[PDB]
């Protein structure tokens, strides 16, 4: 059942390679940088892939893998992803917050909501009672939908009042994040952690591609542009 | 290994009030332009929402665990500490922000609140019965330190802001010093310490203090003049 | 080879609980007055470090913070409670140092986060069942520390040598203390019960107790007596 600890190793190893090179890249590129504003963006955007490197290595080496009893058998679960996402997503949000110079009110309401989204997901991923896992999923999705709402119908208007570079950069990112983040509830749902439509194998591969691109990718769009009165 | 069955009604009622209290605070902060009042709404809404998630887990059994102390397995709801760990520092942040407290006292405060819950959690999961009280004492000492700065510290600075501020804070300060200090008493006499009171009534007690300490504290706050705006 | 524990190093943990608790009451019954908001931060940060450590030292004393990890072919005792402590403690020591040199929000985050990976990774290696892998995590955690010390040494110095002669002097002493005491942790752990068998858990608990007391209570003193915290 979702025979793990061996098939998806190549995906996990690959995810570790990209995330690590992606990190060494953003490290051996932030070298100069004087502007204190651009300093935040480089800091935030380098820890995201870095944290991920750590977590992908655990899954590859086994540690981040655990078994849960549900549906009818011993089910392989990678909790290490929620260890990653728990911190990683809020940093991704901080980048956009700092880029649109959002109010401290929305930043908190955003990070805290993000906390519930991952937290609730972790719960559902480890819940033993099958039916309930989807109660947590629904709650986690509602949390993401709220975050995506303020990013789309909230951070755009405030972005379209900054500089043409800012409004244009935020938008590309906003597009990449509303799309990449919304796929997560879908993969989770059809994967080893919900219905068994798709095997852990493909559930690892899909996450590894959405991850690299929601991180190394998102970071490339951001760090290569004019990061608000700094570059 | 029943553990979670009698107090289901309390937990479900607790999940109910925490859910509605949140939706209420969500479908109430709709407008709000002032960045200062924005903070208060953001802080005050996460508290009940966080508690919703945690009460649900207890009701669905997940937030329940068996601790082997005193020749037996014991029904311990760790989910309260998962809740409290984050929830309480937020209630204190509202207060800090209301009295425009220094970043020094905020950190000292939050830090201390972290020790309070963390220690309580440790005590609640300790196998050696005796020790559980050592941790309870250490936790109470931490609470006592917190309530001090809130009472004999945050008041003086509140009585120098505005008549709305000083009056609002005082009502909250009254509600928090009273509700917060009840917790160590319920824990001590409950299923987590001495068996004076069954897990049942305890779950009910916490559920009444939780709803008021959050949805109640929230209402008093979100109805008054919350800094630079409303 | 190694084997079960929970009693020889009771004294080291007791003494460690001891010093840490006193050091905290000392820093508490010393921050009594203090009106300056700038120095306020420093007292608030420097007080919690030992307070957190007291809690984590006591747990290791009362057995709670001890656990058994299977590896190398046999079960083994590990004190995870240190990592619980360090996770929150070390970054506060960095915050004190960042606030002193008035460091940029960019580097504070780049510092805290790196510290998170440093402890976190350490914890992971400490709990890894496959023996070979534990060193892979060690290597990584050390690389994280090394970075952290770099921005402190070859980074916070130059920004310090531009503040006030008090600041520049206070920071250098601390910098000297941290770079020296922090760099021992990877050495103790590598030779200790959580790595190779060179030295028993007994002495490894002792070593960390010496290093913890000084790196916190010692550091805390050098700092709260400098007034180069703009507070009097
Ligand atoms: O599942 S049942 O509701 O039917 O009753 C209990 C038993 O089935 C028991 C033995 O299988 O398992 C219990 O659920 C497992 C535990 O879940 C939570 O803790 C888990 C921990 O066990 C896992 O190791 C970890 C990931 O691998 O996730 C969590 O930390 C707690 O609720 C525990 O109390 C519980 O035993 C089940 O409740
Ligand atoms: O073999 S001994 O009897 O001599 O000692 C063992 C027993 O006392 C046994 C009793 O069940 O407990 C063993 O320690 C258990 C672990 O306790 C703590 O971890 C718990 C975790 O297991 C629980 O899931 C959770 C809530 O239920 O609380 C804690 O996190 C830690 O102290 C672990 O290190 C310890 O192994 C004891 O060794
Ligand atoms: C954010 C601060 C407050 C907490 C930091 C916590 C650390 C990142 C550790 C994260 C541990 C995760 C949530 C554990 C989930 C349950 C796993 C089965 C435990 C495996 O040890
Ligand atoms: C179940 C989940 C989706 C509930 C989500 C709750 C939200 C994260 C709470 C955030 C604060 C709410 C919106 C009330 C304050 C109103 C502010 C204008 C929000 C943005 O700062
Ligand atoms: C303000 C910031 C620091 C906190 C934001 C909100 C927090 C992340 C709270 C959300 C925590 C969720 C419910 C997860 C709790 C931990 C899980 C019960 C662990 C399961 O082992
Ligand atoms: C596994 C623990 C140590 C790490 C995760 C802790 C959470 C981030 C917040 C606090 C939750 C406490 C520590 C959980 C205690 C053990 C419970 C049986 C966990 C059930 O998920
Ligand atoms: C065991 C318990 C009581 C320890 C509590 C320790 C405190 C959280 C430490 C906070 C910092 C102390 C008060 C020193 C700074 C002095 C400030 C005037 C305190 C309020 O900001
Ligand atoms: C806001 C931040 C920087 C300061 C506050 C940090 C908190 C004081 C740290 C929490 C410490 C408590 C004692 C919890 C330690 C870990 C738990 C005892 C583990 C339970 O398995
Ligand atoms: C203080 C709040 C954030 C909860 C504590 C967060 C710490 C990361 C958790 C402390 C436990 C560390 C990580 C070790 C986990 C493994 C232990 C066997 C779990 C016993 O609780
Ligand atoms: C594996 C270890 C060495 C990776 C550590 C990476 C760091 C957390 C990243 C910090 C940001 C790097 C230095 C790139 C931005 C340059 C800035 C001057 C950093 C301080 O804001
Ligand atoms: C404040 C936030 C945003 C930044 C700091 C976050 C930390 C760097 C995140 C910690 C990541 C390390 C690898 C720990 C992951 C969780 C542990 C491996 C769980 C052990 O059971
Ligand atoms: C190999 C070198 C670079 C390691 C780092 C420096 C050394 C740890 C220096 C020792 C630092 C202070 C004196 C603490 C020593 C504590 C131990 C009892 C030392 C045992 O040799
Ligand atoms: C709503 C929802 C989820 C959303 C996850 C997201 C949005 C992950 C983002 C990952 C990133 C950004 C990685 C770097 C979870 C947690 C899968 C739980 C199931 C439902
Ligand atoms: C001192 C002490 C405690 C304090 C708990 C408090 C003050 C809880 C506040 C709850 C809120 C605010 C709910 C929302 C614990 C943790 C029960 C452990 C026993 C001793
Ligand atoms: C790099 C490395 C480590 C560094 C630890 C440090 C530097 C601890 C500092 C402790 C203090 C200051 C205590 C108070 C760990 C985590 C042992 C893991 C093994 C290698
Ligand atoms: O990740 C697989 C390989 O991809 C190549 O494009 C990189 O240059 C290598 O460094 C990497 O190992
Ligand atoms: C083969 C290593 C380079 C891959 C580039 C991927 C960019 C997201």
Short mmCIF file of C-alpha atoms in Angstrom, two decimals, chain A residues 27 34 36 39-40 43-44 47 50-51 53-55 57-58 60-63 79 91 94, chain C residues 104-107 109-110 112-114 117 121 123-124 127-130 133 136-137 140 147:
data_model
loop_
_atom_site.label_atom_id
_atom_site.label_comp_id
_atom_site.label_asym_id
_atom_site.label_seq_id
_atom_site.Cartn_x
_atom_site.Cartn_y
_atom_site.Cartn_z
CA UNK A 27 23.76 32.32 -1.60
CA UNK A 34 23.97 46.74 0.25
CA UNK A 36 18.75 46.95 3.52
CA UNK A 39 18.63 42.42 1.97
CA UNK A 40 15.32 41.21 3.44
CA UNK A 43 17.37 36.58 3.25
CA UNK A 44 13.75 35.41 3.17
CA UNK A 47 15.98 30.27 3.79
CA UNK A 50 17.43 26.00 2.48
CA UNK A 51 14.78 24.77 4.92
CA UNK A 53 16.87 21.08 1.44
CA UNK A 54 16.89 19.93 5.07
CA UNK A 55 13.42 18.43 4.84
CA UNK A 57 17.06 15.07 2.83
CA UNK A 58 15.11 13.63 5.76
CA UNK A 60 15.27 10.71 1.21
CA UNK A 61 17.16 9.26 4.19
CA UNK A 62 13.98 7.86 5.68
CA UNK A 63 13.61 9.92 8.86
CA UNK A 79 5.37 14.38 7.91
CA UNK A 91 8.29 33.24 4.45
CA UNK A 94 6.41 37.65 3.88
CA UNK C 104 19.74 45.07 9.57
CA UNK C 105 16.41 43.17 9.66
CA UNK C 106 17.77 41.26 6.70
CA UNK C 107 20.70 39.75 8.61
CA UNK C 109 16.31 36.91 9.85
CA UNK C 110 19.22 35.35 7.94
CA UNK C 112 17.76 33.35 13.31
CA UNK C 113 16.68 31.11 10.43
CA UNK C 114 20.20 29.68 10.01
CA UNK C 117 18.43 24.92 10.77
CA UNK C 121 19.24 19.58 11.93
CA UNK C 123 18.01 17.31 16.63
CA UNK C 124 17.36 15.20 13.50
CA UNK C 127 17.43 11.00 16.63
CA UNK C 128 18.51 9.21 13.46
CA UNK C 129 18.45 5.42 13.69
CA UNK C 130 20.90 4.89 10.80
CA UNK C 133 23.46 9.42 8.52
CA UNK C 136 25.63 13.80 7.51
CA UNK C 137 23.32 15.91 9.69
CA UNK C 140 25.18 20.18 7.79
CA UNK C 147 27.96 30.59 8.61
#
